[PDB]
Amino acid sequence: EEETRELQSLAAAVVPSAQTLKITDFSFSDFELSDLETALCTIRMFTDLNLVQNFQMKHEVLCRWILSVKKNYRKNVAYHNWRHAFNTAQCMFAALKAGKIQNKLTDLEILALLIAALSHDLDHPGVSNQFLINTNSELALMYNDESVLEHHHFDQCLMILNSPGNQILSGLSIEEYKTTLKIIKQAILATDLALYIKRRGEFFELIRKNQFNLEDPHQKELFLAMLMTACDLSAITKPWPIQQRIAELVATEFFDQGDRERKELNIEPTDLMNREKKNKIPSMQVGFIDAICLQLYEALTHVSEDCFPLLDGCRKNRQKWQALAE
Ligand SMILES: CCCc1nn(C)c2c(=O)[nH]c(-c3cc(S(=O)(=O)N4CCN(C)CC4)ccc3OCC)nc12
Ligand SMILES: [Mg+2]
Ligand SMILES: [Zn+2]
Secondary structure (H helix, E strand, C coil), rough: CCCHHHHHHHCCCCCCCCCHCCEEEEECCCCCCCHHHHHHHHHCCCCCCHHHHHCCCHHHHHHHHHHHHCCCCCCCCCCHHHHHHHHHHHHHHHHHCCCCHHHHCCCCHHHHHHHHHHHHCCCCCCCCCHHHHHCCHHHHHHHHCCCCHHHHHHHHHHHHCCCCCCCCCCCCCHHHHHHHHEEEEEEHHHHHHHHHHHHHHHHHHHHCCCCCCCHHHHHHHHHHHHHHHHCCCCHHHCHHHHHHHHHHHHHHHHHHHHHHHHHHHCCCCCCEEEEEEEEHHHHHHHHHHHHHHHHHHHHHHHHHHHHHHHHHHHHHHHHHHHHHHC
């Protein structure tokens, strides 16, 4: 049996310190790590955020839950796979520790954010919401064309949290368990960039006016949404060699969607989805940075100056892509 053999390699392995694993570093790369090592790093994130302790999680159950999450990503999808989820969670961990956000949030909020980060792209098919709408997918029918993928990832998140031996939330009060599932749903839906674009203006306005206040529950929920997007997009902040490699993965997934469009829908893909247009990736990345990323990382740095490395890396990669676009 291959599954029991993975569980045993994992629950008996020593979990190295966060310092040894480099998971506190905003610049962290997963590329040299084995699958088992990514699982050990995940355990370390739950432990050093005091979640295992504060929520009385049994080791074996956390181990089983992590391996269930990992297995429920599609390995053949080029970008939206377990490594992206793992890296998103790692960025969350770095933001909370190095970025000093941990002290601004409750243990219950942190718990939800970490589970949401790990689960937020579960079972991603490697095509966009717009593709799912255009093909009349059963998912888009179930969810009325609204954040289709994200509703699906949340469904998958609940399926895993409820599977026998994977119940990492069992130590909570019933009221706190319900509140936590609601925060997880909000966090996963927030990763729909359509919702990011709708909500960002309010966030930026509060910061511009010098009025942002995390003690206000509405502003706190807005912040959690923004933080999820910041972690989700964080490959754009990484050291140049890592960003170049990840950008190639993103483009591979987009081009594969375009190939499906050309055959299943008989349409001409747009340049973003057309492999013929690979030479345009530098200009497309500069556009992505300018339209979406820069202002988000600027805004996050206002909330915590210790998150500056994310902004710094984003700006460095903009220069690198712009030089290739010329
Ligand atoms: C859903 C994927 C979001 C995303 N994550 N990361 C790390 C990237 C990235 O590096 N690039 C792009 C990207 C965005 C645009 S875009 O801003 O123009 N954009 C197209 C996609 N939609 C959904 C939003 C707008 C164009 C090209 C891109 O990648 C080329 C490798 N998207 C993401
Ligand atoms: Mg997603
Ligand atoms: Zn994602």
